From a paper:
One extracellular protein family that arose through domain replication and gene duplication is the gel-forming mucins, huge glycoproteins that coat and protect the epithelia in the lungs, intestines, and other organs. A remarkable variation on the theme of mucins arose with the evolution of the complex vasculature in the vertebrate lineage. [name] ([name]), a glycoprotein responsible for hemostasis, has a similar domain organization and is homologous to mucins in its amino- and carboxyl-terminal regions. Under acidic conditions, the amino termini of mucins and [name] form noncovalent intermolecular interactions that juxtapose VWD3 assemblies from different CTCK-linked dimers. We present residue-resolution structures of [name] and MUC2 amino-terminal segment tubules, enabling comparison between them and an analysis of the features that stabilize each one.
To compare the two tubules in more detail, we produced tubules of the [name] amino-terminal segment according to a reported method. Due to furin cleavage during recombinant protein production, we assembled the [name] tubules from the D3 dimer and D1D2 fragments purified separately. The [name] and MUC2 tubules also both display twofold symmetry perpendicular to the helix axis. They differ, however, in that the [name] tubule is a one-start helix, whereas the MUC2 tubule is a two-start helix. The [name] tubule has a helical twist of 86.0° (about 4.2 subunits per turn) and an axial rise of 2.85 nm per subunit. These values are in close agreement with previous results, which reported a helical twist of 85.6° and an axial rise of 2.62 nm for the low-resolution reconstruction of the [name] tubular scaffold.
Residue numbers in the entry:
A (entry chain B): 31 to 210, 221 to 416
B (entry chain B): 833 to 1207
C (entry chain D): 556 to 624
D (entry chain D): 1041 to 1178
E (entry chain D): 279 to 347
The structure:
């Protein structure tokens, strides 16, 4: 039991139930959070009708800001990545930036296109409140304004959730007054690739937004593909995942290198600085990317299996780069230093007021007044 | 310190030694060890090394899938939000013996995947602790809050690894990382036993003692040292001869500076409880709890229907495993001095299982077929 | 008028619902306990007038004129 | 508000509001109709920012006990002490010679003044609902 | 007797074939297409190296086109 609302395309919205529309704003609207005992809040920052940055808020003390280009902050600081903290593990996944909260219950991504996704849980049933709408199975009455009344205009509904903070005051939002050649949107209605998602969801609304976008078409093939990922992800979460689409006309969702976009990748994503513990990856299929099969992933990019560097004291060394100790030395194999033991000299220091050091290493203080035997 | 007439003996924990020609002659017997979490940022290897390492994801306490032999067990001690010792800290332990997990979290045990060898699988609730027996040698002792201990008998000698060392009798080399290299400071040692490769390894705290939550007051730094100097005050002066309170004091200075406690005093009583527990293993039982210093009661679960039959008391260390209609024969519980609240019913009418009321021996299982309770 | 709904529990903190504007409300509504007003601290206690400022700024839409109101 | 000890963390001022927001949780909801929990909340927020507790926790339980004292004067006795929230015991003084005869128990408010060989007559004790550990002999 | 699995990923020079370029090992010589009776149980041939085109495209005489055409 876990739903999904997403912000995608350019100026589009989907809720926890399906009723989906458009909106372009300026004022960091409220995307989720119970409105009787708040206890956390997801806030979605926009800019000039676009989607810039994403942020949570725990209580009234802790902030985190995530941004679309992968830079993360603290409210006034600039933290690195991954950065685990008081709950709330920022990480990376099949190539996307995941923010996981399991004590409270939610998980939020941001992919290369800057598309947001948040998955809630079953204990927030009939208690969510924000812009993603309430969470009950009945899918029609999901426009309750902050007053509690119900409306019909998307803009009048969604302007009641904007949040302003001090320096940033915000205005009322007005629909853009700008109106408008191939129809590839029906690719959801002809081919048998999508034919198995038909008895779970109705492909009409997606065609509707697809022609809405077709109106714009500031480009060659950008018209339809952002309208096509979302339907795949929706009917994937609905219970049956589509297999091997994108092989006909899709526009290759982007991730940096390797580009091996595929469905059903294990989030564990075996690399070579690992303990190869099996049996403990019980996570569902997640779309994303990776890099072929014969390569293992490093922190930046992924390298062939023959070149996993070793680590000492957090440094990285290329294979066959023997370090030298005082007593011994040994050589980096495939991430497995192999030294040979050998006895090396010992020293017994006696310094300070009364501070000794044994032959092995034990440090201590004695301070007695007589003659004593130090070695023999 | 003391005199010893010739021919007299002395026993040290596990072995006995006698005087022969001004020199002690006595026998060797490698016997069991214990790796434990002293408090909530410090560890104690099998050979008695103390180190500091605060992390926040899943790590490896002790396993044996590292040598040139097929592994058997594996215990993982992933903790939640304990990169800082605040009161919000919670810990979880998962045990993978043959084909199951146990999930020590919050209340009690789970059995999420039955083991095919329940022939030596027990769970015991005595005092304020829970005792798990997982094989001929392996045991786990749990406080129910934050202290986890593990006992291995002499069979597993030189055959394990993890954040608890390799159990061979040498301290110096028992700090090796997962890739066969001996580190220098504990922080870069412990990153190597991390299970998931997406944890943001802890960096390093550069400062000295009295963490930053202290030393800016020294009105709070000089109350903490005296508040838990009771480790040397009047009850522990007999312990101090046998085990030195140098490391446990330095645990107490930590995680009391760094632990903003408001109405929950558990962040402080548990360190003193650890030191007292270690004394009890040396035959030096102590009593230290007053009416104004970490008080404890166990009269709440006292049959509210009538209650006049006061069947519960708080004892010093309450010998550990008592038979009932659960395991009607003595076990091998490696503690024998569990502090807690204890039931002292007369020789007849032993204690029951579920309703916590001593009853006459009729209410034992009818038969032991299929290993079921059978009332 | 008997058709008006009787309100239930009054709520004290409005910016538990708009956490974006928590820093601004505390920072701005702090002139009242500052040497600018020090002469008047002995004439009327600025205790109610401070929590009023915090509530006004956290709650109302246009906090620019709620501050100086 | 929030003396100089607080408002410099707000990882502690957000931990002391919810630590003693229990005055409105589930048991005191009867009191909230008859006595409002507003001044006692301000009492609790204070002297817990400015009271660093290390091994002693009376600096916090006393405020809750004072509010409970106020409630019981209005005939709304409550029970709030658990094993993990300000625990209390009184069986230490239980005749250690034998101990099996338990004559002391912890009651809700243990009505105040009882007769014995001290004053064999009723007194004027204007509380009559004194919480504590009590003896209930036949 | 032991076919090599998943090489060519390090330093190979991509052995050339006209279309698809999906050089891979252990490909069935049955080479399923849509102009066939989808008869199974009669692909009992050992592994052979060669080429094909992804998975979602079926081979025609000249090249391979999506299943819809
Ligand atoms: C990802 O996007 C964010 C925002 O879209 C980028 O952050 C922005 O970075 C610029 C460059 O430093 C910041 O401008 C600077 O602002 C300071 C303070 O006003 C000023 O003193 C400097 O002279 C400069 O103008 C800008 O404030 C900042 N915006 C934020 C943090 O909201 C970020 O750089 C992007 N990531 C990458 C890798 O470029
Ligand atoms: C949601 O909760 C309200 C109030 O608790 C109730 O009236 C309503 O029927 C609930 N809706 C559903 C679908 O259960
Ligand atoms: C100790 O005593 C035993 C028998 O009493 C003897 O065999 C052994 O050699 C003695 N060892 C030493 C070191 O004296
Ligand atoms: C604890 O139990 C043991 C065994 O029943 C008993 O000898 C001892 O007196 C008890 N301690 C107390 C304080 O009652
Ligand atoms: C408290 O005392 C009164 C009067 O003796 C009694 O009726 C009541 O049951 C007692 N409360 C408890 C919890 O024992
Ligand atoms: Ca709904
Ligand atoms: Ca060793």
């Amino acid at each position: 039991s876990t739903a999904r609302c997403s912000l995608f395309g350019s100026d589009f919205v989907n809720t926890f139930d399906g009723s989906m529309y458009s909106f372009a704003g300026y004022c960091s609207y409220l995307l989720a959070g119970g409105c009787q005992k708040r206890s956390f809040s997801i806030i979605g920052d926009f800019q000039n009708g676009k989607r810039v940055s994403l942020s949570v808020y725990l209580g009234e003390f802790f902030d985190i800001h995530l941004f679309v280009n992968g830079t993360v902050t603290q409210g006034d600081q600039r933290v690195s990545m991954p950065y685990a903290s008081k709950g709330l593990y920022l990480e990376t996944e099949a190539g996307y930036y995941k923010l996981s909260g399991e004590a409270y219950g939610f998980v939020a991504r941001i992919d290369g296109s800057g598309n947001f996704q948040v998955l809630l849980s079953d204990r927030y049933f009939n208690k969510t409140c924000g812009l993603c709408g309430n969470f009950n199975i009945f899918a029609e009455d999901d426009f309750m304004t902050q007053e509690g009344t119900l409306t019909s205009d998307p803009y009048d509904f969604a302007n009641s959730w904007a949040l302003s903070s001090g320096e940033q005051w915000c205005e009322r939002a007005s629909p853009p007054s700008s109106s408008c050649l191939w129809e590839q949107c029906q690719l959801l209605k002809s081919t048998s690739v999508f034919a198995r998602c038909h008895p779970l969801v109705d492909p009409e609304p997606f065609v509707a937004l697809c022609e809405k976008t077709l109106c714009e078409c500031a480009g060659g093939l950008e018209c339809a593909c952002p309208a096509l990922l979302e339907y795949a992800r929706t009917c994937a979460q609905e219970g049956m995942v589509l297999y091997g689409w994108t092989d006909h006309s899709a526009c290759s969702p982007v991730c940096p290198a390797g580009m091996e976009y595929r469905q059903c990748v294990s989030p564990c994503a075996r690399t070579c600085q690992s303990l190869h513990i099996n049996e403990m990856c019980q996570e569902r299929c997640v779309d994303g990317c990776s890099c072929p099969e014969g390569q293992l992933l490093d922190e930046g990019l992924c390298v062939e299996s023959t070149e996993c560097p070793c680590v000492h004291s957090g440094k990285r060394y290329p294979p066959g780069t023997s370090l030298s100790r005082d007593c011994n030395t040994c050589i980096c194999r495939n991430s497995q230093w192999i030294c040979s033991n050998e006895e090396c000299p010992g020293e017994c220091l006696v310094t300070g007021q009364s501070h000794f050091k044994s032959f092995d290493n034990r440090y201590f203080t004695f301070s007695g007044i007589c003659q004593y035997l130090l070695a023999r | 310190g003391k005199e010893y007439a010739p021919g007299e003996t002395v026993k040290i924990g596990c072995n006995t030694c006698v005087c022969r020609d001004r020199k002690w002659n006595c026998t060797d017997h490698v016997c069991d060890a214990t790796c434990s979490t002293i408090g909530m940022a410090h560890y104690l290897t099998f050979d008695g090394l103390k180190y500091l390492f605060p992390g926040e994801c899943q790590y490896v306490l002790v396993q044996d899938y590292c040598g040139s032999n097929p592994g058997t067990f594996r215990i993982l001690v992933g903790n939640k939000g304990c990169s800082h010792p605040s009161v919000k800290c919670k810990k979880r332990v998962t045990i993978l013996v043959e084909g199951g997990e146990i999930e020590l979290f919050d209340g009690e045990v789970n059995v999420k995947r039955p083991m095919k060898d329940e022939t030596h699988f027990e769970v015991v609730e005595s005092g304020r602790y829970i005792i798990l027996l997982l094989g001929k040698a392996l045991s786990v002792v749990w406080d129910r809050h934050l202290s986890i201990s593990v006992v291995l008998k002499q069979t597993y000698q030189e055959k394990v690894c993890g954040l608890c060392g390799n159990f061979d009798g040498i301290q110096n080399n028992d700090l090796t990382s997962s890739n066969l290299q001996v580190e220098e400071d504990p922080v870069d040692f412990g990153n190597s036993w991390k299970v998931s490769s997406q944890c943001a390894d802890t960096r390093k705290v550069p400062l000295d003692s009295s963490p930053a939550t202290c030393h800016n007051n020294i009105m709070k730094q000089t109350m903490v040292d005296s508040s838990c100097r009771i480790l040397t005050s009047d009850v522990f002066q007999d312990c101090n001869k046998l085990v030195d309170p140098e490391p446990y004091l330095d645990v107490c200075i930590y995680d009391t500076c760094s632990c903003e406690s408001i109405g929950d005093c558990a962040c402080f009583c548990d360190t003193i409880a650890a030191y007292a527990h270690v004394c009890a293993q040396h035959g030096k039982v102590v009593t230290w709890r007053t009416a104004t210093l970490c008080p404890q009661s166990c009269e709440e679960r006292n049959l509210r229907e009538n209650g006049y039959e006061c069947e519960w008391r708080y004892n010093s260390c309450a010998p550990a495993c008592q038979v009932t209609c659960q395991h009607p024969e003595p076990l091998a519980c490696p503690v024998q001095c569990v502090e807690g609240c204890h039931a002292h019913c007369p020789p007849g009418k032993i204690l029951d299982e579920l309703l916590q009321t001593c009853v006459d021996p009729e209410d034992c299982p009818v038969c032991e077929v299929a290993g079921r309770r059978f009332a | 008028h008997g058709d008006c709904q009787d309100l239930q529990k009054q709520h004290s903190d409005p910016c538990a619902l708009n956490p974006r504007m928590t820093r601004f409300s505390e920072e701005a509504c702090a002139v009242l306990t500052s040497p600018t007003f020090e002469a008047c601290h002995r004439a009327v206690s600025p205790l109610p007038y401070l929590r009023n400022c915090r509530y006004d700024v956290c709650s109302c839409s246009d906090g620019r004129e709620c501050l100086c109101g």
